[model samples]
Target: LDPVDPNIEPWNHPGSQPKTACNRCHCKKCCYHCQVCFITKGLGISYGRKKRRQRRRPSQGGQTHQDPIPKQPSSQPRGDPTGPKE
Candidate 1:
């Protein structure tokens, strides 16, 4: 899958923070798939079903507009967006 798809919005930007790190995503797509046999097992339930994908709906609906990343509180750490100072 193309991680930089504009439909992925802020995630498509070079410096944009990902919901999960690149290594983690690589692990899931590679290691996890290797362990679970992704094709035979079908996209995991967490990833949504095969035919009627039930993943979280984007803020709006379709891909008309990109969703802006939620505003970070000024008190948040300089770099991280998760929570508290690291």
Candidate 2:
């Protein structure tokens, strides 16, 4: 087949390098900031599964801090308790 879609050609990155441990990009080596090559397969392929909702700790042991320490009340009155100094 003829190259009708010239835009999807690997003109810039023509499989110069090998594929690494990344999901995106195929050719043009495994360098950083490299664009995806059309000639190279698995451009948009995902290596892992999609992200799902994380566990919300259902019910048991869900309560963090149920009770807190209460503030101590003042037993005696403040200032001039016995008598005024004048």
Candidate 3:
């Protein structure tokens, strides 16, 4: 079976991409399922944005698991709204 690629940044649709650069996002919390190139440019987090809780996949032992993404509050987008409501 194919395990979900956690590295793919399934957390897309985090929010909108502003015109100007913002704060740093070392954690994947700010990732909008964004491409690696965006992360390379340090555009993950926004300006003056408060740090949010990092949401990493659960791991079994030292290695990271690749289980399928189950339904949850903010697992995927249904096309109606977004994770953080403004």
Candidate 4:
């Protein structure tokens, strides 16, 4: 079966383009659905900004022999966390 229908193209909408499928993504968790169009069309890299966890590094004066402790886990886990327990 044809998974894509150019007739029902989302790009027809306002401000839409061939890459609208990737830009108009609703889910914020995974990129599988978005990647389908991006990868197939050889769009290369996505311009979407990555979600980086806010971090604070100690100042030079505050530096210690021990490494900076990792931040606490987020209340909402994104995926699996099977590493060393906190």
Candidate 5:
């Protein structure tokens, strides 16, 4: 039964830190109602910052074949229509 040690009332109380019952007691020094140190510190509980699903940026309108633009037309006229001799 010896597990009720929580009597530190030397007139201390202003901003907290002296009112115990069970905040997270692992039982190494400070305790109150210890259920054999509350086992189960591992196996699967990995806390926070891991909700991944943001990976997509590749293949933006693909299909290439570009190269044709020189330009040259002078003054345009009847010129030739198989009636002038080369």
Candidate 6:
């Protein structure tokens, strides 16, 4: 039985405040800046079912362009965007 209640635990940001959003935290590949989401999630828990192998779509429908991580050209070959012929 776990003693600590996640809801009870106040928002404890693991970096410079004024409390950055998870999306901002998540934007970084490893979330190097924001450990709060990872740590606060408790038990080292993080994103699950983080989808893989698909057309990468812009976050928030591309409304926000502030993210500076230049989108790398899709590595899969153009003819067969999906990897490994079945």
TM-score of each: 0.19, 0.15, 0.18, 0.16, 0.12, 0.16
- Please give the clash total of every predicted structure, in order: 0, 0, 4, 0, 0, 0
Q: What is the clash count of model 6?
A: 0
List the candidate 5 regions with Cα displacement exceeding 4 Å. 1-9, 20-86
lDDT per residue as tens, model 2, 1-86: 11332225322211112222343454433542232432224432343322121122231121111111012111112322222211
Residues forming the 10-long window of minimal summed lDDT in candidate 5: 61-70
Q: What is the lDDT for 30 in model 6?
A: 51
Assess candidate 1 and give its TM-score to the true structure. Answer: 0.19
Off by over 4 Å in 4: 1-7, 16-25, 28-86
lDDT of 4 by residue, 1-86 (tens): 11352112221121122223366455321443222231123221344323121122332121110112223222213223322221
Q: What stretches of model 3 exceed 4 Å from their correct place? A: 1-3, 17-34, 37-78, 83-86
Candidate 3 has an lDDT of 0.31
Clashing pairs for predicted structure model 5, backbone only: none
lDDT tens digits, residue span 1-84, model 3: 112322344333333332113534554344433323221234333432222222444522211112213233332244335334
Candidate topping TM-score: 1
The CA lDDT at 10 in model 5 is 20
- How well does candidate 5 score on lDDT at residue 20? 36
lDDT of 5 by residue, 1-86 (tens): 11232122121111112223343334422332112212222211332212121111121111110111002111111222212111
Tell me the tens digit of each residue's lDDT in model 1 across 1-86. Answer: 32332223322221222323343355333533221222223323355334212133343222111122324222224543443322
Ranking by lDDT: 3, 1, 6, 4, 2, 5
Error of 2 at 11 (Å): 6.5
Candidate 5 RMSD to the real structure = 36.6
Candidate that would win on lDDT: 3
